[PDB]
Amino acid sequence: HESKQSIMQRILTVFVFTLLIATVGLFIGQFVPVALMLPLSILEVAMIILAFWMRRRKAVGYAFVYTFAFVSGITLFPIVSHYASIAGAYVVLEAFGSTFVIFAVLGTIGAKMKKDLSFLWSFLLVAVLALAVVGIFNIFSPLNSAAMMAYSVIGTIVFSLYILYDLNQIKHRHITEDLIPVMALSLYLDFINLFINLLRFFGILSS
Ligand SMILES: [Ca+2]
Ligand SMILES: [Cl-]
Ligand SMILES: [Cl-]
Ligand SMILES: [Cl-]
């Protein structure tokens, strides 16, 4: 018989694994020819849209989640290589480091706080959809550095709040063991989208 503790620890374990796998994918992605990479603007907004689309009460399997992490990791190399090329490779470390402790702190607080943050669900959905709209607009009408930085700050706030909210709902809601991959998948999409926002922000800022 599972407890709230074990289910949490299992979700977090799968989440850590999605990061490790994605990192392997990222490493592999450096070998993809330039002529076979998707446009930066397309890849960036794609992760936002997926973050929304994967957020369903549908039990997905470990196979999907782990394969998703591997393939998405590969496709995020053009994003990493771009902002590294305009601000130095060190900004990737900066972005990752900043994403890590934000997730670690906000994740812990959300998972430990007594307040039920369930009321944020609709607000957060609208916000992510709003980021998707701007992300799509960017494809056909490229925003400047100033606007893109403002976009990154909003995106940072939205996904930071989602991390707090997600860990909070894992504690408060009724999560069964068949929901473990989809809960971890959301945490993974939180991390990556927060990482992309910070990478873009600090990359543009140091350019
Ligand atoms: Ca069991
Ligand atoms: Cl319990
Ligand atoms: Cl599935
Ligand atoms: Cl269960």
Curated annotation (Swiss-Prot):
According to its record, what are the GO cellular component terms?
membrane; plasma membrane
What's a GO biological-process term for it? Answer: regulation of proteolysis
GO molecular function terms attached to this record: calcium channel activity
Q: Where in the cell is it found?
A: Cell membrane
The residues exposed to the Cytoplasmic compartment are 1-10, 55-61, 113-117, 171-180
Q: Which InterPro entries match?
A: Bax_inhibitor_1-related
Notes on activation and inhibition: The calcium-release activity is mediated by two factors: pH and transmembrane ion gradient. It was proposed, based on an MD simulation, that the conserved aspartyl dyad (Asp-171-Asp-195) regulates Ca(2+) binding, pH sensing, and the channel pore opening and closing, and that protonation of Asp-166 probably weakens its interaction with Arg-55, facilitating the opening of the channel. Another study using nanodiscs suggests that Asp-166 is not a pH sensor regulating the pore dynamics; instead, it is only involved in the gating of calcium ions.
Transmembrane stretches in the record are 11-32, 40-54, 62-81, 91-112, 118-141, 147-170, 181-202
Q: Site: Important for activity. Where?
A: D166
Q: Which UniProt keywords apply?
A: Calcium, Calcium transport, Cell membrane, Ion transport, Membrane, Transmembrane, Transmembrane helix, Transport
* Side Extracellular, residues: 33-39, 82-90, 142-146, 203-207
Membrane topology of this protein? Multi-pass membrane protein
One family name in Pfam for this protein: Bax1-I
Protein role: Calcium channel that probably plays a role in the regulation of calcium homeostasis. Uptakes calcium ions and mediates calcium flux in proteoliposomes in a pH-dependent manner. When expressed in E.coli in the presence of high extracellular calcium concentrations, shows calcium-leak activity, increasing intracellular calcium concentration. It can also mediate Ca(2+) flux from the endoplamic reticulum (ER) when expressed in permeabilized mammalian cells. Calcium transport activity is also detected in ER-like lipid vesicles.
Cite the record's note on assembly: Monomer.
Q: Which family does it belong to?
A: Belongs to the BI1 family.
Instruction: Supply the name of the protein.
Output: pH-sensitive calcium channel
User: Gene of origin?
Assistant: calJ
